[PDB]
């Protein structure tokens, strides 16, 4: 609701959004912290160095 | 139809990648390039040339990419037509 | 993954800041200066280099590609243009705010009516919220009449859309713009504005941003001979108003007539931007309906914020009736050839799979196995239906091909309602004729379904991550034992049970 | 400042099913887009089969970052994680 | 003015590059995109300190894309001009409306209006130079000038100097 | 810390039975022949009688079993129920070991009492649910496996292993390894979305549903009614 | 990090020799060492910086720089400005560097003595 007046007040005093809500990340589309998304995967530089010269 | 109960079932299965795919591919997802300094719609990108240029800030060093609903993209474009600028920042200020 | 590769880091937004389009920034973001009056160049085909359909802004024509970004229409978002007005004009949204700000501080020198000696002013400045500071400044500055210069402050009254001063003279946009241009940064901060970005001289409209044709839907209700949206007509009217404003400043003409034509242009842009204007008529179309201003495009049921979107081609799901099949594995699902041809899976061409994938491409979309579309590295989508030279098509590594749904492809399968987590499971496709999905009998009990005409839904993963997740987490054999009561949910039933007894 | 020392790691040494699924999916994606293959290819063409073959031989050049609830994390190589 | 500064960069690596070229190949992209490049925040990064021993860290795999994101952290040397800084410049070119002097890796244009009226320019004289009684300014000379303002051009920042202040000149 | 799909109904053998039956089944005495291990099942019967150290070990084992009996009866299961869902089916493992190594044909076992006791104790110390050397972590790990430890100590008793199961050295080691591996396989994977699973597994039985009972009583409980029916 | 010209020259020289040993892999004056690099903009920046440093060479000895550091190591900016710009007396030293006036411990006579005494006199 009140989007026109929200924009009015935003132009009046530079409204800013914290984006703390889950709706922002849902709109952005980031992997959720659950199941397969409960961790991070990093490339193993040490293993690649330990790989043969072709790898 | 992919309703709420299907979402709960896939949450129970714990397959977050499928949730991301449903939330993007079965929705209005679209890639948008944003300057990391101005945060406006002034980015020219050449993938074959692998170059980026922000005409607002004369910046060609750092430009980020985002996945946004393109309904929100049209809203942002007509909001530029509003002559009031949504400055997109990927970092908070506190 | 469907998008072509981009070296830019993929992040997420954490703060959106609503600011103001400064005219220099409007010029900078505009891809080309536009001055030519009408849309059509010379009534001799092609868009006008300087028209409202300028190709630099990014067209909406399929065969044409935007020259600015160099992307195709599947990737081009469009680009902005800017129209410079010689006479600065007010902003219809901010005219009440313009009057309030004029009544806030002294227009003669740009200074506040009160100083920091008042502890209330210090508290308002120390308040984190700019809204509360602005409210306190307005409340504590209305009572005070003297400025901080010995000059009496005239009262600004809003008559129609004009502002009149009562010391007297009519307020003029040039003088008001200069008065804001004389505002010090500390007065900018005290007023609740930001000197760097939300600088209070931006409410003066000197250049207007014309959006690409992507923003307003110009429906092609009949081939090439089409009209335009109400926004385009109002923009043309505004440009004509600006042209006749410009053409009446070097030649002799009454000043009040010049101001009246300026107010005419102001009302044009006001009706273009705002529809429901209080105390004045709205812009009415030739049919009598009001002109759809951009303010209402984001407010109300017809507004986009509540939700209004259309235009896409998604066919990654199916729904149909089922039947039993004793000759199927527990994790197999029978799929009609028509349903298999309707759905598609995008596979990336590698060295190992190039031969059979080229065979599928040569087969075409009307035969199984086969393919429907071929996506290049840049994102061009060759449709094999209209490509009569499909037999002379070569594929390079990294290209995508949307092949038909094939055997052993993991697909998600569901019955409504999905009360429990094993009401939706991943099965392996077996393509067989006729128009019913086929299932093993033993999986009907967990689905809680019978073959009396019930319908089932099917989804196809579109990426390697989704395929791996379905095959490793939602597979049928993994769902035999349920965590609800640590006992199996699938068993021998019906004819097999009677026969084994 | 937040990484846990290798000798101080306390999480399970086995590869969870979610970790296995994510590793297989990521490796299949990488192989599908022409990454070098760490294990010989006999006759298989499916990227997921190649990823499973690499996992069976502990030839996955990836590192799991298990995030503790407070914010700290543990780094585990796919070679040092026990696979059933 | 020279400084030692700690810098960080974002790198994106395609999965097709996942081979024996993790460290040195990312490092050479870093050198190409950083060494000999200007930024508004920290001036010109002319070189880097211990280039071959720069820790690239561990690359995060962005989900759904496969591209690896690297946080490359290093320490390098930068050059920065300052407002009011007094520096000695080797003048390179002289024109009737001033002179171009090369300082460090950049060039500063100083106009003729700020030059005091005692020193008079001559194009007819060989070489065209700013001379006067016991005073001579021509190409190849060290001129002590104070920087009035620096323009942030991002790609190659510039600045302007002046000699209209006391105790300014060759010492 | 266990998964819901990795538990089956198993019986704690110490809970039921009389004290005399408990003593007959578990107590071992190396002084009296009738209270000792039967000579036909071990190759070293003549080397056992009079061994003080083995008697002390057996006394310690019996004291541990008595403590488990008292703790189970007086604290956990007052009503005396002995069948409960627990991980790792010990009976299936034992019979699989019997089938694999052919523990039939009544051949005297070479297993020694200290080996059996030490192996059982080490297995009971290797059931890792939580890892770390913190005192709280160790206490929580000890608390989380009390019932399973009681089950293992009840099933793998000296008399039960020798007279009844007749395991040999290889069978005993295989049983210990299999039990350890299967217990490690029965833990819950981190990142499980257990809340949705619990909600679904509670809602589902309600579909197929003097005091108020059934769906109205369920709704009364869920709504937290101040005044119930 | 505030930096004077002397150890700046030391740093750039050691970085150049280190990259010649490592990056070039088997590779002494200013011009050709500047020309070792690649990239037109990079070549121009490198050659301009190196010729500017060579034409403005203040300190060319290592142990003398160590002795100056031992004597000095006093604002870091002041430390950099003391070595970057030469001085002869207090009257113009306070003109170029105004911070010397408000110190209350001048000691500029001796300081200038070792500044113009350790190496070749300026
Ligand atoms: Mg039915
Ligand atoms: Zn920008
Ligand atoms: Zn475009
Ligand atoms: Zn005033």
TrEMBL record, chain A:
<comment type="function">
    <text>DNA-dependent RNA polymerase catalyzes the transcription of DNA into RNA using the four ribonucleoside triphosphates as substrates.</text>
</comment>
<comment type="similarity">
    <text>Belongs to the RNA polymerase beta' chain family.</text>
</comment>
<protein>
    <recommendedName>
        <fullName>DNA-directed RNA polymerase subunit</fullName>
    </recommendedName>
</protein>
From TrEMBL, chain B:
<feature type="binding site">
    <location>
        <position position="54"/>
    </location>
    <ligand>
        <name>Zn(2+) 2</name>
    </ligand>
</feature>
<feature type="binding site">
    <location>
        <position position="38"/>
    </location>
    <ligand>
        <name>Zn(2+) 2</name>
    </ligand>
</feature>
<feature type="binding site">
    <location>
        <position position="38"/>
    </location>
    <ligand>
        <name>Zn(2+) 1</name>
    </ligand>
</feature>
<feature type="binding site">
    <location>
        <position position="54"/>
    </location>
    <ligand>
        <name>Zn(2+) 1</name>
    </ligand>
</feature>
<comment type="function">
    <text>DNA-dependent RNA polymerase catalyzes the transcription of DNA into RNA using the four ribonucleoside triphosphates as substrates.</text>
</comment>
<comment type="similarity">
    <text>Belongs to the RNA polymerase beta chain family.</text>
</comment>
<protein>
    <recommendedName>
        <fullName>DNA-directed RNA polymerase subunit beta</fullName>
    </recommendedName>
</protein>
<feature type="domain" description="RNA polymerase Rpb2">
    <location>
        <begin position="1"/>
        <end position="90"/>
    </location>
</feature>
<comment type="subunit">
    <text>Component of the RNA polymerase II (Pol II) complex consisting of 12 subunits.</text>
</comment>
<feature type="binding site">
    <location>
        <position position="35"/>
    </location>
    <ligand>
        <name>Zn(2+) 1</name>
    </ligand>
</feature>
<feature type="binding site">
    <location>
        <position position="57"/>
    </location>
    <ligand>
        <name>Zn(2+) 1</name>
    </ligand>
</feature>
TrEMBL record, chain C:
<feature type="binding site">
    <location>
        <position position="450"/>
    </location>
    <ligand>
        <name>Mg(2+) 1</name>
    </ligand>
</feature>
<feature type="binding site">
    <location>
        <position position="106"/>
    </location>
    <ligand>
        <name>Zn(2+) 7</name>
    </ligand>
</feature>
<feature type="binding site">
    <location>
        <position position="106"/>
    </location>
    <ligand>
        <name>Zn(2+) 8</name>
    </ligand>
</feature>
<feature type="binding site">
    <location>
        <position position="109"/>
    </location>
    <ligand>
        <name>Zn(2+) 4</name>
    </ligand>
</feature>
<feature type="binding site">
    <location>
        <position position="69"/>
    </location>
    <ligand>
        <name>Zn(2+) 2</name>
    </ligand>
</feature>
<feature type="binding site">
    <location>
        <position position="79"/>
    </location>
    <ligand>
        <name>Zn(2+) 2</name>
    </ligand>
</feature>
<feature type="domain" description="RNA polymerase N-terminal">
    <location>
        <begin position="201"/>
        <end position="501"/>
    </location>
</feature>
<feature type="binding site">
    <location>
        <position position="147"/>
    </location>
    <ligand>
        <name>Zn(2+) 9</name>
    </ligand>
</feature>
<feature type="binding site">
    <location>
        <position position="454"/>
    </location>
    <ligand>
        <name>Mg(2+) 3</name>
    </ligand>
</feature>
<feature type="binding site">
    <location>
        <position position="149"/>
    </location>
    <ligand>
        <name>Zn(2+) 8</name>
    </ligand>
</feature>
<feature type="binding site">
    <location>
        <position position="452"/>
    </location>
    <ligand>
        <name>Mg(2+) 2</name>
    </ligand>
</feature>
<feature type="binding site">
    <location>
        <position position="69"/>
    </location>
    <ligand>
        <name>Zn(2+) 1</name>
    </ligand>
</feature>
Automatic annotation (TrEMBL), chain D:
<dbReference type="GO" id="GO:0006362">
    <property type="term" value="P:transcription elongation by RNA polymerase I"/>
</dbReference>
<keyword id="KW-0804">Transcription</keyword>
<dbReference type="GO" id="GO:0005665">
    <property type="term" value="C:RNA polymerase II, core complex"/>
</dbReference>
<dbReference type="GO" id="GO:0006366">
    <property type="term" value="P:transcription by RNA polymerase II"/>
</dbReference>
<dbReference type="GO" id="GO:0005736">
    <property type="term" value="C:RNA polymerase I complex"/>
</dbReference>
<keyword id="KW-0597">Phosphoprotein</keyword>
<comment type="similarity">
    <text>Belongs to the archaeal Rpo6/eukaryotic RPB6 RNA polymerase subunit family.</text>
</comment>
<dbReference type="GO" id="GO:0003899">
    <property type="term" value="F:DNA-directed RNA polymerase activity"/>
</dbReference>
<keyword id="KW-0240">DNA-directed RNA polymerase</keyword>
<keyword id="KW-0539">Nucleus</keyword>
<dbReference type="GO" id="GO:0003677">
    <property type="term" value="F:DNA binding"/>
</dbReference>
<protein>
    <recommendedName>
        <fullName>DNA-directed RNA polymerases I, II, and III subunit RPABC2</fullName>
    </recommendedName>
</protein>
């Amino acid at each position: 609701e009140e989007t026109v007046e929200i924009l009015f007040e935003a132009g009046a005093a530079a409204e800013l959004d914290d984006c703390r809500g889950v709706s922002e990340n849902v709109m952005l589309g980031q992997l959720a912290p659950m199941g397969t998304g409960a961790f991070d995967v990093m490339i193993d530089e040490k293993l690649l160095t330990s790989l043969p010269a072709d790898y | 139809r992919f309703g709420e109960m299907e979402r709960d079932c896939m949450i129970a299965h714990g397959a977050a990648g499928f949730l991301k795919e449903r939330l993007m591919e079965a929705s209005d997802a679209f890639r948008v390039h944003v300057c990391g300094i101005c945060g406006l719609m002034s980015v020219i990108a050449n993938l074959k040339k692998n170059q980026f240029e922000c005409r607002s800030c004369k910046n060609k060093t750092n430009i980020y990419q985002l996945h946004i609903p393109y309904a929100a993209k049209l809203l942002f474009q007509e909001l530029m037509a509003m002559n009031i600028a949504p400055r997109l920042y990927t970092e908070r200020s506190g | 993954s469907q998008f072509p590769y981009s070296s830019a880091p993929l992040r997420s937004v954490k703060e959106v800041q609503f600011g103001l389009l400064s005219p220099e920034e409007i010029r900078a973001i505009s891809v080309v200066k536009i001055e030519y009056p009408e849309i059509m160049d010379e009534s001799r085909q092609r868009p006008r280099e300087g028209g409202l359909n300028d190709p630099k802004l990014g067209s909406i024509d399929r065969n044409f590609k935007c020259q600015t970004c160099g992307e195709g229409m599947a990737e081009c978002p469009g680009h902005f243009g800017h129209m410079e007005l010689a006479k600065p004009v007010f902003h219809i949204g901010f005219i009440p705010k313009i009057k309030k700000v004029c009544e806030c501080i002294c227009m003669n020198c740009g200074k506040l009516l009160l100083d920091e000696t008042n502890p209330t002013m210090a508290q308002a400045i120390r308040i984190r919220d700019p809204k509360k500071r602005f409210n306190a400044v307005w409340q504590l500055c209305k009572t005070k009449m003297v400025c901080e210069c010995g000059n009496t402050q005239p009262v600004v009254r809003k008559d129609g859309m004009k502002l009149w001063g009562t010391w007297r003279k009519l307020l003029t946009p040039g003088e008001i713009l200069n008065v804001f241009k004389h505002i010090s940064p500390e007065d900018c901060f005290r007023l609740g504005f930001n000197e760097d970005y939300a600088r209070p001289e931006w409410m003066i409209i000197t250049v207007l941003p014309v959006p690409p044709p992507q923003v307003r839907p110009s429906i092609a209700m009949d081939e090439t001979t089409q009209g335009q949206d109400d926004l385009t007509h109002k923009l043309s009217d505004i440009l004509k108003a600006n042209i006749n404003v410009q053409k009446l400043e070097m030649d002799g003409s009454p000043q009040h007539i010049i101001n009246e034509v300026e107010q005419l242009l102001q009302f044009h842009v006001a009706t273009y931007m705002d529809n429901d204007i209080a105390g004045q008529p709205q812009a009415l179309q030739k049919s009598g309906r009001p002109v759809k201003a951009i303010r209402a495009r984001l407010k109300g049921k017809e507004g986009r914020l509540r939700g209004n979107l259309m235009g896409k081609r998604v066919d990654f799901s199916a729904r149909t009736v089922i039947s039993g099949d004793p000759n199927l594995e527990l994790d197999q699902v029978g799929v009609p050839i028509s349903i298999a041809k309707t759905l598609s899976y995008p596979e990336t061409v590698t060295q190992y799979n190039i031969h059979r994938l080229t065979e599928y491409v040569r087969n075409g979309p009307n035969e199984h196995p086969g393919a429907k579309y071929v996506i290049r590295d840049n994102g061009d989508r060759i449709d094999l239906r209209y490509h009569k030279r499909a037999g002379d098509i070569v594929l390079q590594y990294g290209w995508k091909v949307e092949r038909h749904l094939m055997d052993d492809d993991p697909v998600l399968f569901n019955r409504q309602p999905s009360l429990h987590k094993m009401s939706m499971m991943a099965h392996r496709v077996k393509v067989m004729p006729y128009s019913t999905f086929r299932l093993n009998l033993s999986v009907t009990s967990p689905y809680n379904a019978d073959f009396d005409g019930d319908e089932m839904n099917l989804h196809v993963p579109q990426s390697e991550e989704t395929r791996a997740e379905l095959s490793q987490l939602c597979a049928v054999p993994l769902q035999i034992v349920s965590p609800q009561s640590n006992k199996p949910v699938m068993g021998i039933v019906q004819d097999t049970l009677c026969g084994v007894r | 400042e937040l990484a846990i020392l290798k000798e101080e790691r306390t999480t399970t040494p086995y590869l969870t099913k979610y970790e296995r699924a994510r590793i297989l999916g990521t490796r299949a994606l990488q192989i599908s887009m022409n990454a070098p293959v760490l294990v010989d290819i006999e006759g298989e063409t499916d990227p997921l089969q190649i990823a499973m073959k690499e996992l069976s031989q502990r030839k996955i050049p990836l590192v799991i970052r298990r995030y503790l609830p407070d914010g700290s994390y543990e780094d585990w190589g796919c070679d040092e994680l026990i696979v059933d | 003015m020279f400084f030692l500064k700690d810098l960080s960069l974002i790198l994106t690596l395609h999965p097709s590059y996942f081979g024996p070229q993790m460290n040195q190949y990312l490092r050479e992209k870093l050198l190409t995109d950083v060494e000999g490049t200007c930024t508004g925040q920290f001036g010109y990064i002319v070189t880097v300190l211990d280039g071959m021993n720069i820790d690239v860290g561990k690359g995060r795999i962005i989900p759904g894309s496969g591209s690896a994101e690297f946080e490359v952290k290093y320490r390098a040397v930068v050059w920065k001009p300052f407002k009011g800084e007094v520096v000695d410049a080797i003048v390179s070119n002289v024109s009737p409306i001033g002179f171009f002097a090369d300082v460090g890796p950049l060039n500063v244009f100083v106009s003729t209006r700020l030059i005091p009226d005692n020193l008079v320019y001559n194009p007819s004289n060989s070489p065209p130079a700013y001379m006067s009684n016991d005073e001579l300014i021509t190409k190849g000379s060290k001129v002590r000038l104070k920087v009035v303002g620096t323009r942030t051009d991002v790609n190659e920042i510039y600045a302007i100097g002046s000699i209209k202040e006391d105790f300014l000149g060759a010492i | 810390g266990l998964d819901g799909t990795q538990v089956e109904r198993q019986t704690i053998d110490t809970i039921p039975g009389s004290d005399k039956a408990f003593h007959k089944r578990y107590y071992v005495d190396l002084m009296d022949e009738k209270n000792s291990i039967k000579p036909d099942v071990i190759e070293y019967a003549a080397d056992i009688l009079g061994d003080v150290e083995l008697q002390k070990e057996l006394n310690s084992e019996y004291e541990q079993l008595v403590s488990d009996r008292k703790f189970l009866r007086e604290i956990v299961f007052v009503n005396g129920d002995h069948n409960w869902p627990l991980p790792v089916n010990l009976r299936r493992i034992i019979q699989n070991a019997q089938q694999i190594f052919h523990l039939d044909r009544a051949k005297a076992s070479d297993l020694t009492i200290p080996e059996i006791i030490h192996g059982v104790r080490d297995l009971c110390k290797k059931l890792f649910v939580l890892r770390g050397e913190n005192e709280l972590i160790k206490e929580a790990q000890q608390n989380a496996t009390s019932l399973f430890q009681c089950l293992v100590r009840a099933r793998l008793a000296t008399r039960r292993i020798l007279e009844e199961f007749r395991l040999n050295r290889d069978a005993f080691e295989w049983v210990l390894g299999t039990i350890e591996a299967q217990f490690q396989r029965s833990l819950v994977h981190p990142g499980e979305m257990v809340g949705v699973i619990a909600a679904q597994s509670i809602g589902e039985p309600a579909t197929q549903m003097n005091v108020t009972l059934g769906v109205p009583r369920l709704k009364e409980i869920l709504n937290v009614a101040k005044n119930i029916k | 990090i505030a930096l004077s010209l002397s150890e700046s020259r030391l740093l750039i020289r050691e970085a150049l020799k280190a990259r010649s040993r490592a990056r070039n892999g088997g590779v002494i004056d200013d011009d050709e060492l500047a020309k070792v690099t690649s990239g037109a903009v990079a070549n121009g920046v490198v050659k301009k910086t190196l010729d500017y440093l060579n034409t403005f060479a203040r300190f060319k000895d290592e142990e003398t720089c160590t002795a100056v550091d031992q004597l000095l190591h006093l604002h870091p900016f002041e430390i950099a400005q003391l070595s970057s710009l030469g001085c002869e007396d207090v009257d113009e030293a306070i003109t170029l560097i105004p911070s010397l006036a408000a110190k209350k411990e001048v000691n500029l006579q001796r300081i200038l003595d070792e500044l113009n005494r350790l190496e070749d006199p300026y």
